[PDB]
Amino acid sequence: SHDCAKVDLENAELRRKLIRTKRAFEDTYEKLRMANKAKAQVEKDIKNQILKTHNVLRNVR
Amino acid sequence: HDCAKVDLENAELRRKLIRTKRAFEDTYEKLRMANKAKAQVEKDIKNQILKTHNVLRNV
Amino acid sequence: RLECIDVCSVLTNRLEELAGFLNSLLK
Amino acid sequence: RLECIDVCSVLTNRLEELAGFLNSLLK
Ligand SMILES: [Zn+2]
C-alpha cells in the first residue's frame, strides 16, 4: 500500500498550504470587492459631473 | 491512522488546493490588471488637471 | 441669454469644480 | 491678455475635452 508517515506529512502540509492559499484568496478577493464598490461610487460621481458639464455647455451655445 | 481515510483526505485536499490556487491566481490577476489601469488613469487625470489649472490660472 | 462675461463666469465655475473633482479622483 | 469672447472659447474647449475625458473614464 502507501507509506503512512508520508501521507500524514503530506496531509498536514496540504492543510497548511490550503489555509495559506485560502487566506490569500479571501484577502485578494476582499480587495477586489472594495475596488468594485469604489468603482460604482466613482462612476456615479463621474456621471454627475458629465451631466453638469453638458448642461453648462448646451446652455451656452 | 486509517489508511483509506487519509488517502481520501489527501486527494480531496489536493483538489481543494488546485481550485483555491486557481481562484487566487485569477482574483490576483484581475487585481493586477486593475492596478495597471489605476496607474494609467491616474496619469491621464493628472494631465487633465494640469491643463485645466493652466487654463484657469491664465484667466 | 447670458452675456459673455456671465458665460465666462459659469464656464469658470464649472471648470474649477471639475479641477477639484478630478483631484478628488486622485485621492 | 485675451478678450472675453476668447476666454469663453478657451474655457469652452477645455470643458468639452473634460466632458469627453470623463466619459472615457466610464469606458
Ligand atoms: Zn496508512
Side-chain angles (χ1 to χ4, degrees), chain A residues 8-38:
Chain A
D8 291 326
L9 280 175
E10 289 184 19
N11 194 284
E13 183 175 16
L14 286 165
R15 289 183 193 279
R16 296 187 295 261
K17 284 181 187 181
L18 183 61
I19 288 168
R20 289 191 290 259
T21 307
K22 187 185 187 65
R23 189 186 297 106
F25 160 66
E26 283 172 20
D27 292 343
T28 307
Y29 187 88
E30 171 62 13
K31 292 195 291 299
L32 207 289
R33 189 186 61 82
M34 300 277 297
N36 289 343
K37 181 173 183 184

Side-chain angles (χ1 to χ4, degrees), chain B residues 22-38:
Chain B
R22 199 69 183 92
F24 160 67
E25 283 172 20
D26 292 343
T27 308
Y28 186 87
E29 170 61 13
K30 292 196 292 299
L31 206 54
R32 188 184 61 81
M33 300 276 82
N35 289 343
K36 182 172 184 183
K38 180 85 169 209

Side-chain angles (χ1 to χ4, degrees), chain D residues 6-25:
Chain D
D6 295 329
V7 178
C8 271
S9 294
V10 172
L11 296 172
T12 294
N13 296 333
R14 184 87 287 268
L15 266 193
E16 290 179 346
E17 178 158 331
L18 276 177
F21 168 76
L22 295 177
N23 193 42
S24 71
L25 280 167

Side-chain angles (χ1 to χ4, degrees), chain A residues 2 7-8 10-11 15 25, chain B residues 1 3 7 9-10 14 27:
Chain A
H2 64 199
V7 299
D8 291 326
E10 289 184 19
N11 194 284
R15 289 183 193 279
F25 160 66
Chain B
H1 64 200
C3 298
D7 290 326
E9 289 184 18
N10 273 19
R14 288 183 192 101
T27 308

